[PDB]
């Protein structure tokens, strides 16, 4: 879809609600993909089987992120983890997009974190939200904790309102930083909506990342809607600021190649461009 310059973006956005397009719009993104040369077979290998905390979210095979193999006396295969390299804004792959790991895979969402050089983690969830398990907790409470060959220690956590910044160290033991930046303003009542403090979350997370050679980790619950919704927000303020334009649609449609169901749901979808409106009027 077209590169909408900011100045007319506002009426642009007005005019799908007013207009109520937004609807075909979104699906037009969900059917657009159409599996074309798209396959999940790693993801639905038996070894993989407990590795996935959905049965319906995979990792497509192109653009997983694949772990080293190791050989375990159990024999299994040792490559994978729910997570797909996701395209940003001039910058293939600049995200890992990922499942919240569970009790057993935080060794390998960890290592994943080692292997392919990550400095920098975003969390678009709290542990459990009305009351259900979302993400199991991966770093220390209080400290230090080994998973498996990955010793991690938090050194500090910057407690804000609607957002926590945990800075620990990652160390493999068989011989680094990676800050978290993890929102936790999620509504009981109702649904999410508000701009201010998600753009600053969203600009300070852009701001610790700018430099890093690595990728960031983007993971929510499943790792596809919250996570989706970050990653173009968070292109779309690079666009917007490097050319003054504005592609969603044909930014998202670009990395619903790469993970499955990134963006999830119309409501996120819209979100996007109410809050993107927003940002610009300053
Ligand atoms: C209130 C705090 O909300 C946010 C904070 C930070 C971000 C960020 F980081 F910029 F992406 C985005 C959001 C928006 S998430 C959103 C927006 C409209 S519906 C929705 C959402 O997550 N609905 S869900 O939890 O029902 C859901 C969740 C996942 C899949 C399907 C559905």
């Given at each position: 879809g077209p590169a909408i310059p900011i100045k007319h973006f506002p009426?642009?956005?007005?005019?799908?609600?007013?207009?109520?397009?937004?609807?075909?719009?979104?699906?037009?993104?969900?059917?657009?993909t159409v599996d074309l040369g798209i396959t999940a077979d790693?993801?639905?290998?038996?070894?993989?089987?407990?590795?996935?905390?959905?049965?319906?979210?995979?990792?497509?095979?192109?653009?997983r992120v694949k772990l080293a193999q190791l050989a375990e006396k159990d024999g299994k295969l040792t490559d994978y983890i729910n997570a797909n390299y996701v395209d940003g804004y001039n910058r293939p792959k600049a995200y890992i997009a990922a499942q919240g790991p569970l009790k057993s895979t935080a060794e390998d969402f960890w290592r994943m974190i080692w292997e392919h050089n990550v400095e920098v983690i975003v969390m678009i969830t709290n542990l459990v939200e009305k009351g259900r398990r979302k993400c199991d907790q991966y770093w220390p409470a209080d400290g230090?904790?080994?998973?498996?060959?990955?010793?991690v220690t938090q050194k500090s956590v910057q407690v804000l309102?609607?957002?926590?910044?945990?800075?620990?160290?990652?160390?493999?033991?068989?011989?680094?930083?990676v800050t978290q930046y993890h929102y936790t303003?999620?509504?009981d009542m109702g649904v999410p909506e508000y701009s201010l403090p998600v753009l600053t979350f969203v600009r300070k997370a852009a701001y610790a990342k700018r430099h890093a050679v690595g990728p960031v980790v983007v993971h929510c619950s499943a790792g596809v809607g919250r996570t989706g919704t970050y990653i173009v927000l968070d292109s779309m303020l690079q666009q917007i600021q490097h050319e003054g334009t504005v592609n969603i649609f044909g930014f998202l449609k670009h990395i619903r190649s790469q993970r499955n169901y990134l963006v999830q749901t119309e409501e996120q979808y819209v979100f996007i461009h109410d809050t993107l409106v927003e940002a610009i009027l300053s």
């Open positions: 009426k642009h956005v007005a005019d799908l609600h007013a207009s109520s397009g937004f609807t075909e719009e979104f699906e037009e993104v969900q059917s657009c790693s993801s639905n290998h038996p070894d993989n089987k407990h590795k996935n905390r959905y049965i319906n979210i995979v990792a497509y095979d192109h653009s230090s904790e080994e998973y498996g060959n990955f010793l309102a609607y957002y926590t910044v945990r800075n620990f160290t990652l160390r493999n033991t068989k011989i680094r930083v303003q999620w509504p």
